[PDB]
Scaffold this active site. Structure first.
Site, PDB file in Angstrom:
ATOM      1  N   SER A  50      20.247 -29.123   1.808  1.00  0.00           N
ATOM      2  CA  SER A  50      21.189 -29.532   2.810  1.00  0.00           C
ATOM      3  C   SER A  50      20.886 -28.865   4.188  1.00  0.00           C
ATOM      4  O   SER A  50      19.853 -29.140   4.768  1.00  0.00           O
ATOM      5  CB  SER A  50      22.655 -29.326   2.338  1.00  0.00           C
ATOM      6  OG  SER A  50      23.561 -29.961   3.289  1.00  0.00           O
ATOM      7  N   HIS A  57      25.959 -33.687  -4.268  1.00  0.00           N
ATOM      8  CA  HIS A  57      25.297 -32.832  -3.313  1.00  0.00           C
ATOM      9  C   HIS A  57      25.206 -31.380  -3.828  1.00  0.00           C
ATOM     10  O   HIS A  57      26.219 -30.704  -4.051  1.00  0.00           O
ATOM     11  CB  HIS A  57      26.111 -32.821  -2.020  1.00  0.00           C
ATOM     12  CG  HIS A  57      25.423 -32.226  -0.864  1.00  0.00           C
ATOM     13  ND1 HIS A  57      24.269 -32.766  -0.324  1.00  0.00           N
ATOM     14  CD2 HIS A  57      25.769 -31.186  -0.073  1.00  0.00           C
ATOM     15  CE1 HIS A  57      23.947 -32.096   0.771  1.00  0.00           C
ATOM     16  NE2 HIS A  57      24.843 -31.125   0.955  1.00  0.00           N
ATOM     17  N   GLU A 103      25.398 -38.255  -2.762  1.00  0.00           N
ATOM     18  CA  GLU A 103      25.417 -37.212  -1.821  1.00  0.00           C
ATOM     19  C   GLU A 103      26.839 -37.165  -1.172  1.00  0.00           C
ATOM     20  O   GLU A 103      27.303 -36.088  -0.816  1.00  0.00           O
ATOM     21  CB  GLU A 103      24.355 -37.457  -0.742  1.00  0.00           C
ATOM     22  CG  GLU A 103      22.907 -37.382  -1.140  1.00  0.00           C
ATOM     23  CD  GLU A 103      22.404 -35.960  -1.297  1.00  0.00           C
ATOM     24  OE1 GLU A 103      23.202 -35.016  -1.233  1.00  0.00           O
ATOM     25  OE2 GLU A 103      21.180 -35.781  -1.532  1.00  0.00           O
TER      26      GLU A 103
HETATM   27  C1  LIG Z   1      25.371 -26.864  -0.582  1.00  0.00           C
HETATM   28  C2  LIG Z   1      26.185 -25.897  -0.019  1.00  0.00           C
HETATM   29  C3  LIG Z   1      27.526 -25.822  -0.337  1.00  0.00           C
HETATM   30  C4  LIG Z   1      28.085 -26.715  -1.232  1.00  0.00           C
HETATM   31  C5  LIG Z   1      29.419 -26.683  -1.578  1.00  0.00           C
HETATM   32  N1  LIG Z   1      30.165 -25.741  -1.014  1.00  0.00           N
HETATM   33  C6  LIG Z   1      31.573 -25.756  -0.687  1.00  0.00           C
HETATM   34  C7  LIG Z   1      31.918 -26.288   0.701  1.00  0.00           C
HETATM   35  C8  LIG Z   1      33.114 -25.554   1.310  1.00  0.00           C
HETATM   36  C9  LIG Z   1      34.193 -26.524   1.816  1.00  0.00           C
HETATM   37  C10 LIG Z   1      34.895 -26.024   3.083  1.00  0.00           C
HETATM   38  C11 LIG Z   1      35.141 -27.122   4.136  1.00  0.00           C
HETATM   39  C12 LIG Z   1      36.338 -26.764   5.034  1.00  0.00           C
HETATM   40  N2  LIG Z   1      35.987 -26.553   6.425  1.00  0.00           N
HETATM   41  C13 LIG Z   1      36.675 -25.761   7.247  1.00  0.00           C
HETATM   42  C14 LIG Z   1      36.059 -24.697   7.902  1.00  0.00           C
HETATM   43  C15 LIG Z   1      36.851 -23.917   8.743  1.00  0.00           C
HETATM   44  N3  LIG Z   1      38.105 -24.183   8.940  1.00  0.00           N
HETATM   45  C16 LIG Z   1      38.720 -25.191   8.345  1.00  0.00           C
HETATM   46  C17 LIG Z   1      40.053 -25.402   8.638  1.00  0.00           C
HETATM   47  C18 LIG Z   1      40.702 -26.462   8.042  1.00  0.00           C
HETATM   48  C19 LIG Z   1      39.996 -27.289   7.192  1.00  0.00           C
HETATM   49  C20 LIG Z   1      38.660 -27.091   6.898  1.00  0.00           C
HETATM   50  C21 LIG Z   1      38.022 -26.025   7.478  1.00  0.00           C
HETATM   51  C22 LIG Z   1      36.344 -22.808   9.418  1.00  0.00           C
HETATM   52  C23 LIG Z   1      34.947 -22.332   9.039  1.00  0.00           C
HETATM   53  C24 LIG Z   1      34.044 -23.524   8.737  1.00  0.00           C
HETATM   54  C25 LIG Z   1      34.711 -24.402   7.674  1.00  0.00           C
HETATM   55  C26 LIG Z   1      29.921 -27.586  -2.505  1.00  0.00           C
HETATM   56  C27 LIG Z   1      29.035 -28.519  -3.015  1.00  0.00           C
HETATM   57  N4  LIG Z   1      27.782 -28.511  -2.662  1.00  0.00           N
HETATM   58  C28 LIG Z   1      27.272 -27.667  -1.807  1.00  0.00           C
HETATM   59  C29 LIG Z   1      25.928 -27.739  -1.493  1.00  0.00           C
HETATM   60  C30 LIG Z   1      29.392 -29.483  -3.926  1.00  0.00           C
HETATM   61  C31 LIG Z   1      30.873 -29.628  -4.258  1.00  0.00           C
HETATM   62  C32 LIG Z   1      31.684 -28.390  -4.053  1.00  0.00           C
HETATM   63  C33 LIG Z   1      31.256 -27.574  -2.862  1.00  0.00           C
END
Ligand SMILES: c1ccc2c(NCCCCCCCNc3c4c(nc5ccccc35)CCCC4)c3c(nc2c1)CCCC3
Ligand SMILES: c1ccc2c(NCCCCCCCNc3c4c(nc5ccccc35)CCCC4)c3c(nc2c1)CCCC3
Ligand SMILES: *[C@@H]1O[C@H](CO)[C@@H](O[C@@H]2O[C@H](CO)[C@@H](O)[C@H](O)[C@H]2NC(C)=O)[C@H](O)[C@H]1NC(C)=O
Ligand SMILES: *[C@@H]1O[C@H](CO)[C@@H](O[C@@H]2O[C@H](CO)[C@@H](O)[C@H](O)[C@H]2NC(C)=O)[C@H](O)[C@H]1NC(C)=O
Ligand SMILES: *[C@@H]1O[C@H](CO)[C@@H](O)[C@H](O)[C@H]1NC(C)=O
Ligand SMILES: *[C@@H]1O[C@H](CO)[C@@H](O)[C@H](O)[C@H]1NC(C)=O
Ligand SMILES: *[C@@H]1O[C@H](CO)[C@@H](O)[C@H](O)[C@H]1NC(C)=O
Ligand SMILES: *[C@@H]1O[C@H](CO)[C@@H](O)[C@H](O)[C@H]1NC(C)=O
EC number: 3.1.1.7
Lengths: 534, 534
Positions: free
Chosen positions: A199, A439, A326
């Site tokens: 990714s 993904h 994905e």
């Molecule tokens: C490669 C790398 C990571 C992966 C992964 N990680 C899990 C992903 C985490 C989800 C968070 C999104 C919210 N993203 C947010 C963020 C912020 N604030 C928010 C505030 C509100 C809502 C969302 C927010 C601040 C910092 C940046 C992010 C996952 C998967 N594949 C991956 C493959 C597959 C399914 C489960 C998670």
């Protein structure tokens, strides 16, 4: 010199640890520093090389993870938590890890892992990135690096040398420089380094292929579900500046100059930044990340597309590919009507909502075009079709089609392309069935987790893992995933004319042509033309 | 009164002729006048009712055909020549023909045939339009009318009463008025008149449904491969004026006023007009005709789309449909790479040429959209796919999709819709196989030609013809093609919700839904939106 766990490098001596793996053992050098801590006044700055040390650096344990947003959507659920930091977070986080066969080799193939996580998260220390199976099974020296994410890595105020942008990518470059300079002491061959990642790590790999300042530091490359031209992987310097000022605005900073804005951001605790990071996105979106690489005129001398078109990139062999579903993760997390414990059949209105989130930069004609391309108008209220439709939209637009554009542009100038389509759904997957082949879920196969009995994979999944690991390591060694003169079926070379690829799954190999070509003509040629005209 | 062949009408007495048909006989009244000859100073003018005559009008023979372009592409070839005038041409051509069972009925269902030919050609006297089989087999009184085509019928200089436009349609209306007023004397019921026609005749049928001044003159309607909203069936009054002035310009007319232009056009021999008629089209096109109906504010009080949307039309029952390969004829005649004695596999460049001719009003984005919708990008050099692709483009855009838009708009306000898809390729077809089920080739089945042994149809084609004729006549009689309480499979009603239709062919009946819906969403909704935005 004295013993197997002690290595003298150009930065000083390092003491590693002996680790069990599959009934045998190897050495591990965990948490080696490659840069000065990018703390205090060095926040947002380019990394500086680590000052050499006297004495023995103890490298028996994992380093801290970089400061990042932590997912709490499904507390305690292994599916999500396997991605979260499993060590304390710190801005003092520029370290690398090395797994080395035992006995120490002399001059063996090196693989350097660059984690994903959207440029806002990720850790070199995750259980799924444990390099010991691959190092042991394939006899490679396996390195995992780290790099600053979020604003710490990618806050961009072009023109300033205090926060220029791209510093996370320069973190990655510095680790690669250290590997170039030091991996011989561990028994690696610095002339045969493959960089690989998933990714954002896959995009990053592509970015080092493109960037003049990185190209010389490695030999070969592997890109898993990520491409440097993906629509989420970079922003213009005006959009970077905009988001950095908006970050300031969210933290009540003085916005009158770069100097004032940076000074204010440097006094905040890390969590303050992370608490508002997501507020700066310009659109209601999914698959868009706030602080990402900037097209700066330096790391990237021109636009990515002009680079790709002119052949302005490292010419070598690449091996790359994508997973079948994905999109599913981003929809689960971000789009109405998708849920973890439901089958997530999607109504027409949740469909239209999801289209809008998925293509946030499109105007209304553009959204109509997308809708038409993915809707079966003989059956337009089928909840399953709407769900899978949107899963394809997100996947195609953000991952598969930019990868295919990269692959076609690269192959014209490059020295050998191998393309895959990973479509095996693991027997022990904890996520629901609707999400398919998610993904990130090839990574456990690439790192050999299915060889570990207790993890509850099938025997055919163990075989698949071994085959993949051996493709990946044979490619890193030779520029070709196939074993010279073996009996096994041959992964053919992707060429401009025939555009072949293979599936990767537990069934006998199948070769196909023109991966998602029909949709990729839409995403890569028609839609951008439509949006430019309107 | 005296005998079966003598009929006294409101315009005077008519003597017809006794005609053999399938081992029996019926009466035929051929060449009855319904308007004054539209000659001299009446060229381009509205028709005037025929002044009644003393004595007996001899109606034993076919009338002259209207002045028109004659196809000489395949001299002597029966496939083409069956459409050309088979009587001398004359501007004195406003006549109708009536076939009446024997013995004379009292008050039976009437069917009035309106020929096609793109508004530039056609004849009531063609062998394929011989009404005797249908009149005999179904016991209907079958009328065929005529109307002025080309500039003689449709030259339009809105504002002038010397050449107002739409006079050909007013020819059709006058014949319908005469039938309303006189068909009782032949044993027809003027309260149960179905108007039916093909291509331009199908559009014409729709036009009388829409036009307030025509609606009362008939009961029910049948539209074969033509719709009043088709992109070729009408022009704006500005585009009409433009083409009429360009016609003048081609004939070295004075263009300073309508009065001068008309006077000059009225002195030309008919052939002079026809010799330059095709020079006035604004685009390089296929399926576009120079002199067609104009949206004048009179015959059509507003835009066709506003009429359809508001329900501003006659509410009755309609039966209508399309052939499988409506495009093939136009491509044969008009597009590079298509030929009669070849399989006509089409190169990519002939494809792109053909797209441009087919959608002559599109800009370049629009042409890209069409190309993408119809190209199989896994196999883009397949000559057969390119050929059939373009056949679908022409068919969809010009016939099937405007018909489907009409059908969906009409069904909301109307009193019963029956929809068909004619996909039988006749066993004795003289045109090549690539052309499939050609525009116009259901007409021979509707008129019962396969009942005639010498014409070399199969027994199953005879059955098909009988079934169609009986659908058509039962519908004309009752508003429903199905026989009350029969055992045969039922043609269901097309409804807004379920959008059912049947195939028409020699195999058992099959009911389908949503005729070419995927493509028609493209033609009817997306493309017009794309072209309006750009
Ligand atoms: C490669 C790398 C990571 C992966 C992964 N990680 C899990 C992903 C985490 C989800 C968070 C999104 C919210 N993203 C947010 C963020 C912020 N604030 C928010 C505030 C509100 C809502 C969302 C927010 C601040 C910092 C940046 C992010 C996952 C998967 N594949 C991956 C493959 C597959 C399914 C489960 C998670
Ligand atoms: C319904 C009605 C007629 C049909 C038909 N008629 C045969 C169609 C005749 C082709 C002539 C086109 C050239 N159209 C032209 C015209 C002029 N000038 C031209 C000058 C140059 C080139 C073309 C010209 C002037 C007058 C108007 C026409 C045919 C078919 N179906 C029909 C179904 C199926 C295949 C064969 C023909
Ligand atoms: C990768 O590059 C190598 C060498 O630069 C290519 O091998 C050369 O092929 C050319 C033409 O076939 C020969 O003239 C040279 O002798 C070859 N060089 C060597 C040292 O073998 C090879 O074809 C390239 N591979 C791809 C897939 O493009
Ligand atoms: C066609 O119109 C007729 C009558 O105007 C419709 O029949 C009527 O149906 C309504 C509601 O079902 C009844 O209240 C009337 O008593 C009916 N009238 C008669 C005289 O039968 C018929 O439903 C319409 N058909 C379609 C397909 O719309
Ligand atoms: C190295 O430091 C780690 C930190 O936890 C500790 O566990 C380990 O005992 C130390 N080993 C040596 C040899 O100092
Ligand atoms: C493997 O399966 C067992 C038995 O059901 C289960 O309790 C355990 O959690 C699984 N182990 C892992 C590592 O998933
Ligand atoms: C009617 O006129 C036609 C014209 O050809 C002629 O053939 C026929 O003999 C005439 N019949 C009568 C009864 O006058
Ligand atoms: C019917 O077939 C015969 C015998 O081959 C042929 O010569 C004739 O032209 C055909 N007749 C018609 C009317 O097509």
């Amino acid at each position: 010199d004295h013993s197997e766990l002690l290595v003298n490098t150009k930065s000083g001596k390092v003491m590693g640890t002996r680790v069990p793996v599959l009934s045998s053992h190897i050495s591990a050098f965990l948490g080696i520093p490659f840069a000065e801590p990018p703390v205090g006044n060095m926040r947002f700055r380019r990394p500086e090389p680590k000052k050499p040390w006297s004495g023995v650096w103890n490298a028996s344990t994992y380093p801290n993870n970089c400061q990042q947003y932590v997912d709490e959507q499904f507390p305690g659920f292994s599916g999500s938590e396997m991605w979260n930091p499993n060590r304390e977070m710190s801005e003092d986080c520029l370290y690398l890890n090395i797994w080395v066969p035992s006995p120490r080799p002399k001059s063996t193939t090196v693989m350097v892992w660059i984690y994903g996580g959207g440029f806002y998260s990720g850790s070199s220390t995750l259980d799924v990135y444990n390099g010991k199976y691959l190092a042991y099974t394939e006899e490679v020296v396996l390195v995992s690096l780290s790099y600053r994410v979020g604003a710490f890595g990618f806050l961009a105020l072009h023109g300033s040398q205090e926060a220029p942008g791209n510093v996370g990518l320069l973190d990655q470059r510095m680790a690669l420089q250290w590997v170039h300079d030091n991996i011989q002491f561990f028994g690696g061959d610095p002339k045969t380094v493959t960089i690989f990642g998933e990714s954002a790590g896959g995009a990053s790999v592509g970015m080092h292929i493109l960037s003049p300042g990185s190209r010389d530091l490695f030999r070969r490359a592997i890109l898993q579900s990520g491409s440097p031209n993906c629509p989420w992987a970079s922003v213009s310097v005006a959009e970077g500046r905009r988001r950095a000022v908006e970050l300031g605005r969210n933290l009540n900073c003085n916005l009158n100059s770069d100097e004032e804005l940076i000074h204010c951001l440097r006094e905040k605790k890390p969590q303050e930044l992370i608490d508002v990071e997501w507020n700066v996105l310009p659109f209601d979106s999914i698959f868009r990340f706030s602080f990402v690489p900037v097209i700066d005129g330096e790391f990237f001398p021109t636009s990515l597309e002009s680079m790709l078109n002119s052949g302005n990139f490292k010419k070598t062999q690449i091996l790359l590919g994508v997973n079948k579903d994905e999109g599913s993760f981003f929809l689960l997390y971000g789009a109405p009507g998708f849920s973890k414990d439901s089958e997530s059949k999607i109504s027409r209105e949740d469909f239209m909502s999801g289209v809008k989130l998925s293509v946030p930069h499109a105007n209304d004609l553009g959204l109509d075009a997308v809708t038409l391309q993915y809707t079966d108008w003989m059956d337009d209220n089928n909840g399953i079709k709407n769900r899978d439709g949107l899963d394809d939209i997100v996947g195609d637009h953000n991952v598969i089609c930019p990868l295919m554009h990269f692959v076609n542009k690269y192959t014209k100038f490059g020295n050998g392309t191998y393309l895959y389509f990973f479509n095996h759904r693991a027997s022990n997957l904890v996520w629901p069935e609707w999400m398919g082949v998610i993904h990130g879920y090839e990574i456990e196969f690439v790192f050999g987790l299915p060889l570990v009995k207790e993890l509850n994979y099938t025997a055919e999944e163990e075989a698949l893992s071994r085959r993949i690991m051996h493709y990946w390591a044979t490619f890193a060694k030779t520029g070709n995933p196939n074993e010279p003169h073996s009996q096994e079926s041959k992964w053919p070379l992707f060429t401009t004319k025939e555009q072949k690829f293979i599936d990767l799954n537990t069934e006998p190999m199948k070769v196909h042509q023109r991966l998602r070509v029909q949709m990729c003509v839409f995403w890569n040629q028609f839609l951008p033309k439509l949006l430019n005209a309107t």
